[PDB]
Design a protein around this ligand. Structure first.
Ligand code: NDG
Ligand code: CL
Ligand code: CL
Ligand code: CL
Ligand code: CL
Ligand code: NA
Length: 129
C-alpha cells in the first residue's frame, strides 16, 4: 500500500506515535516519506547482508527476523514480512522500541539526514487531525 501523506499521519496518530518519546508527528511522517516514499512494501538490501523493511525501513540486523541475516537479532520479535503489510501496526510498535533504545530517531538514517533540523511540521500541515 502506498499511503497518502495525511492518511499516514492519521494512522500514526491513531497508533500513538504523535510525540512518542518527544518526536512530534511531523518527524514520523517525514521519516516515512524519505525512508519508503510512503510505500509499506518497500525493501532495501544493505551492504552487510541485512534488509530494511516497510514504511519505516526497519532493519533485519536487529529488529526483525527474515531468515537470511546471519548473526542478527529479532528484538521486535516479528517476521520482517509483518513490516510490509498495509496495516502499519507492526511497524509502529517496532518503531516504538527502536526510538526508545537511547539514540532516538537518529536510528533512521533518512530522518537524521533529511528531516532532523528542518520544518517537519510541514509534513502534517493541512491534514485534519
Ligand atoms: C531503525 C532502522 O532500522 N533504520 C535503518 C538503518 O538501520 C539502515 O542503516 C538504513 C539503510 O538505508 O535504513 C534505516 O534508517
Ligand atoms: Cl510536527
Ligand atoms: Cl536470520
Ligand atoms: Cl493502518
Ligand atoms: Cl531523543
Ligand atoms: Na534479524
Amino acid at each position: 500500500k502506498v499511503f497518502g501523506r495525511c492518511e499516514l499521519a492519521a494512522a500514526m496518530k491513531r497508533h500513538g506515535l504523535d510525540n512518542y518519546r518527544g518526536y512530534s508527528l511531523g518527524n514520523w511522517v517525514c521519516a516515512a516519506k524519505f525512508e519508503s516514499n510512503f510505500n509499506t512494501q518497500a525493501t532495501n538490501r544493505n551492504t552487510d547482508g541485512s534488509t530494511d523493511y516497510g514504511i519505516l525501513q526497519i532493519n533485519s540486523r536487529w529488529w526483525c527476523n527474515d531468515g537470511r541475516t546471519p548473526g542478527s537479532r529479532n528484538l521486535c520479535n516479528i517476521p520482517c514480512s509483518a513490516l510490509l503489510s498495509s496495516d502499519i501496526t507492526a511497524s509502529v510498535n517496532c518503531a516504538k522500541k527502536i526510538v526508545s533504545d537511547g539514540n532516538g530517531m537518529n536510528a533512521w538514517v533518512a530522518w537524521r539526514n533529511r528531516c532532523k533540523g528542518t520544518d517537519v511540521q510541514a509534513w502534517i500541515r493541512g491534514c485534519r487531525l
